[PDB]
Amino acid sequence: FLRTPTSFLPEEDQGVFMTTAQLPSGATMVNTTKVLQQVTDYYLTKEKDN
Amino acid sequence: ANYFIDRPVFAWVLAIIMMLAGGLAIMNLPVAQYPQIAPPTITVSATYPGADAQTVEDSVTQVIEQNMNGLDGLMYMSSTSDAAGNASITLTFETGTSPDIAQVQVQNKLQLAMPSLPEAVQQQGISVDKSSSNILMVAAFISDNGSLNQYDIADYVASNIKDPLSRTAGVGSVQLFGSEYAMRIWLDPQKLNKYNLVPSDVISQIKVQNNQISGGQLGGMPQAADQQLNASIIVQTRLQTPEEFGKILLKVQQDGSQVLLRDVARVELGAEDYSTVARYNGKPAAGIAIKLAAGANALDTSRAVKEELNRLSAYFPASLKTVYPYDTTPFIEISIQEVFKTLVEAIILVFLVMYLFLQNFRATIIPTIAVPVVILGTFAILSAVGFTINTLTMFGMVLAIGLLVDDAIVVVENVERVIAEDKLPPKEATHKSMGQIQRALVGIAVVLSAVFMPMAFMSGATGEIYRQFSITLISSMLLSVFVAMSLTPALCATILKARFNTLFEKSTQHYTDSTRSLLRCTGRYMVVYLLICAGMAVLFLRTPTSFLPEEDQGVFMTTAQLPSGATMVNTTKVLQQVTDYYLTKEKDNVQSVFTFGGFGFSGQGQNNGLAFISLKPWSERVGEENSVTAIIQRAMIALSSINKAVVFPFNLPAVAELGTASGFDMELLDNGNLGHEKLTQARNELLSLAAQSPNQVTGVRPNGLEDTPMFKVNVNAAKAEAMGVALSDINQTISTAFGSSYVNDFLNQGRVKKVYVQAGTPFRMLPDNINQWYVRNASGTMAPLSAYSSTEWTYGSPRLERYNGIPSMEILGEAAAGKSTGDAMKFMADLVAKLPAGVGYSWTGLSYQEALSSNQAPALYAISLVVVFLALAALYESWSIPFSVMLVVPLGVVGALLATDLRGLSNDVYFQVGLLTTIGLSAKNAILIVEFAVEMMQKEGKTPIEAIIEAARMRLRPILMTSLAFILGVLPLVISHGAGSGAQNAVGTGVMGGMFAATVLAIYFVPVFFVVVEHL
Amino acid sequence: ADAQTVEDSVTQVIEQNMNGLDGLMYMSSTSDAAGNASITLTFETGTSPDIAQVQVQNKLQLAMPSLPEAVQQQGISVDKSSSNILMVAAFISDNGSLNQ
Amino acid sequence: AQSPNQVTGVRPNGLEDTPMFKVNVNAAKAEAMGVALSDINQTISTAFGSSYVNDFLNQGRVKKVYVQAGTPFRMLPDNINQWYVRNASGTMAPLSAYSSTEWTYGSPRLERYNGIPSMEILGEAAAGKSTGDAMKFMADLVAKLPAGVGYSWTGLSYQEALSSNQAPALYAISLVVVFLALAALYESWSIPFSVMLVVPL
Ligand SMILES: CCCCCCCCCCCCCCCCCCCC(=O)O[C@H](COC(=O)CCCCCCCCCCCCCC)COP(=O)(O)OCCN
Ligand SMILES: CCNc1cc2oc3c/c(=[NH+]\CC)c(C)cc-3c(-c3ccccc3C(=O)OCC)c2cc1C
């Protein structure tokens, strides 16, 4: 009992997850839009089966 | 029931469950000095800087009052307008109204009516607050020698202490006594005239230059393509230091020189409100009152608050010391200590009584462990029901202790007697004894529940106190009955085994032979009963009625009132005299004096002053010559040589809700359409019409201020407009010069403070100063204000009052030596009817309750008597037998009344609850005797006389044991003369004088009453 | 307004007044460079959200006068709803006639 | 970051410091030449920020009206040189005359927790380790930080800590309750003692 690890509630597969893109300070929306487009392209191309 | 005898382990498990539940409840149960007794009230406060009383009443108070409708449960509302620019509306709601709901309703109404108020009032902000006055501590902060003035300490507290507090567990609110910092700009009329300037120009330049400008963003959206830069733009920020305010540019002259604010004014970090001088033992000070939370532990909260203040004391700048006037934690500790000591003493006395009468250690063992189980279970029941721990609940527990002692004693005594005779083993003897007294126990439980019920179902402030008492008593009695039917029989079946003696035997023989051969002439004793009942009338006619005895709280209050129009110099001198007296001729008793000059109880003004005097702990002041009452009695004589003042000391009420139970409060409404002068003429007809008959009313005085001279400036609009000077400019100049002008906010060390503009002191002191101010024409030429204005002296009220939207006067007075409150109220009514037609009266504060819940206690007690008779009839299976039991209660009440009159006490809530406890216990004894007689009549075929004689002879011993234990258990309450001795004396007197007479009369009167009722 | 300007004028001013609440567990607070103040008070489990909102809006009026006139005009939203998105519904154009 | 076997993906939930543009307006020179400081501030605020003016009707709905400079005129620090302020006599003067510009630094987001400055840090536990081990490791790491900084658990971590703290008291209370129930049900103190010896099994 002393050596077993503790937790609160197990993780689940809820069918949805999130991605955060944080650009260097002072960046404009052009670069943020390009980065988010890269994220969208990766998710829709390399993971189109899921 | 009876089957718990065969299962001792079940009874032990139930007892352990009760003990665990009681411990868990004690671990987490709110504690406080008193519960919520006062009805919920909501206070609405508005500030109009520089406004008069009439101006405030016209602009703010009436507008707020006209929108205070549609509030659920509102009882009444009273409004006050001061000459300092303060409007205060207090709305008192019905008991049981949720304070948060009422506060949000009042806030919504006021906040809808907000646009109708003047912009000066709106800028300050109108504050709506819940008022409970449940102060836990009042911590004051003082400067050692001279390092910090009052405003420095007040600002440091408000900015570095109030926020660390109010987040401590248990703290619900913190209120500050003092004013924080502000940027004071003192104008100079000569310098303003030199540069052709007016206060309006200064205010406008401060608004423009002490401003926050939102620059925007370089880049920002929408943005061009290939945009790679995005930053915030900073244009201007609010000023922070007095030097920055002094460098504000007002104008640039044709020469080219710059005119700055410092060139026309003095900029200084001053105070927002200068109208209060707070001193602690002659040193500048600032205080905070912590008002606790709901469901919080007063002891733990106090410990945490002291720990946090000690931790913050390392961050104090220099010579800043914390002192703690008015700490209520010691009283709550004392109450619990007294309860625990009483329980232990009762247990020891029970042990002595049983091993003086029964002479068996195993017999004495049972109650010693039975009583604490019921005590802990009562704590658990109190927690489950949703009650807290205060003085009233603990007092109810103290009485409950004797209530449980009775049940334990009778159960063990009956088991022991059935063991002693009939040669029965303990188990079957316990079975027989429990079979003899089960129905009696149930009937006693029902009778006591019906007796204690009426106190629960009361209305007003008294209802809550009586509810605490009755709930504690009922829970304790029901749990004691359950324990006596479940755990005590099992202990008797298990633990028990198969000079004074001769004296007690002879006493029993004498008593039983007298009772048997005392039926020769009973009617004489019957008329003796009549005489006794006559006593319970005559005594009841001579009881001085009170509500709650005043206790040695260790603090009291002295009010100093200068005559009229007196500046704060005279008030400060008078309060210095008061504190010097209290610290130089009462240094052995008096520890500290906290003086507030400029603030009183009849309104804020420069001729009012208050003083809070704190006393040394009871362990250091011993004797009657060092008591609170004697101290204030000597202070009354000493603080009367102070001329040009009405210095008057008195004591804090036991509960801040109410005091002066003989006194009364009334609002003399003007009604009709008569003005203030006619109303004050009617009030002057009063205070003389009532003074003409001292035999009923004594201290009829008004709770308000009287008319004072005022300065009137009449501005000639025609001349000003013809010369080219706008009337608005003149009005703004006068208002800003003599009253303050709040401009905007600035940042002091990251905190938002106000900025004020006003004239310097030597320019706003005398009427001639009005001649020093200039106003500018449309062409730019300055001309004196004396050219268009004339000055005059008028008279006007410095404080105006309204009641339910109608002007009032608030006449408060007192009753005679003995005349009752109802007669005083019914005299003041129809004394008002002699006033000029138009006026009327209303009762507020306490009298309102006494005019709304009057014919309730007799109805409740009649219902209780009917229920008790019905329960007795159901138990005895007869309609005449219960009379012999119901005709014994007056014997219980008479002795307590006699003892209370002999000691010289009053009729307090403690006396009433002790009277009820004694009545219930005597009724229990009579019930047991009559039940035994009824059993020996139903079986064994015996006449009523012999049955009642044998029942009395059998039950003499348990009655003696219970009476001795109860009388000796409350004896230390009589002899206690230290801290908190008022309630202790009341309960000791009532119980000791009631129980002895009750048992003495009952043991002899039950047989004759039974025989007489059976005959008829 | 900038982040510091908001944090001083609005955020701290509002935050000083949220003390006397019944079952408060903890309070977070945020000031943004877009001109946003986002005070967030988490109360104990079992507390009535209606009573908590009533108390919060009661104590917000004690700091409302100290707020600027550009923040008092926009209004102060006191929401008792959850802080986590339950469902997101998006709307698009089939051929592309409508812009964003 | 140098302990990937215990915590992975530790990141701050905030924004880093950014450069800021500061415009210093010469009130003395502005008043000497005639223009008002209030007009200068209003012009800058409207041009580079915005100015909500009024409400209007669009397709039967009330919407807002905004006034702002065009996109080309609020992009670069040099754009301030293109704006003019009217003198009290009607003559327009450039805004760059009575003004200077500089670059400073500032935080774009300020966070406070329980009334004091704070920074929110999110993280995850490494493979094999659980959330409790990650929380313990992060507490140990915070214990090695410069004096004056502390840490708190909020959100899911608060509930996790509360549960892990309060479990054993619940175990003991349940054991006592079941012992007492057995003793009451079977009138003997030997059956509960013989039965409670099997709980460890
Ligand atoms: C076998 C053993 C028994 C012997 C035989 C049976 C004899 C039983 C006789 C019946 C006695 C019943 C007495 C309890 C109910 C009446 C007392 C409270 C009534 C009352 O005034 O109502 C409210 C107060 O009650 C409250 O504050 C709510 C709770 C108060 C209930 C009193 C506590 C009972 C404790 C007994 C349980 C344990 C006994 C068995 C183990 C007031 O109205 P409000 O609430 O609006 O006032 C405003 C505050 N909110
Ligand atoms: C150190 C002595 N102990 C006390 C000192 C006090 O000083 C006070 C000074 C004040 N002005 C300073 C600018 C104001 C406005 C209220 C004060 C109260 C007070 C607060 C709430 C409700 C009623 C009162 C109250 O005055 O009644 C007396 C119990 C007060 C109360 C106590 C116990």
Author numbering:
A (entry chain A): 554 to 603
B (entry chain C): 2 to 499, 513 to 1030
C (entry chain A): 52 to 151
D (entry chain A): 705 to 905
Sentences from the paper on this structure:
Bacteria can resist antibiotics and toxic substances within demanding ecological settings, such as low oxygen, extreme acid, and during nutrient starvation. MdtEF, a proton motive force-driven efflux pump from the resistance-nodulation-cell division (RND) superfamily, is upregulated in these conditions but its molecular mechanism is unknown. Whereas we discover distinct transmembrane state transitions within MdtF, which create a more engaged proton relay network, altered drug transport allostery and an acid-responsive increase in efflux efficiency. Physiologically, this provides means of xenobiotic and metabolite disposal within remodelled cell membranes that presage encounters with acid stresses, as endured in the gastrointestinal tract.
Here, we report cryo-electron microscopy structures of Escherichia coli multidrug transporter MdtF within native-lipid nanodiscs, including a single-point mutant with an altered multidrug phenotype and associated substrate-bound form. We reveal that drug binding domain and channel conformational plasticity likely governs promiscuous substrate specificity, analogous to its closely related, constitutively expressed counterpart, AcrB.
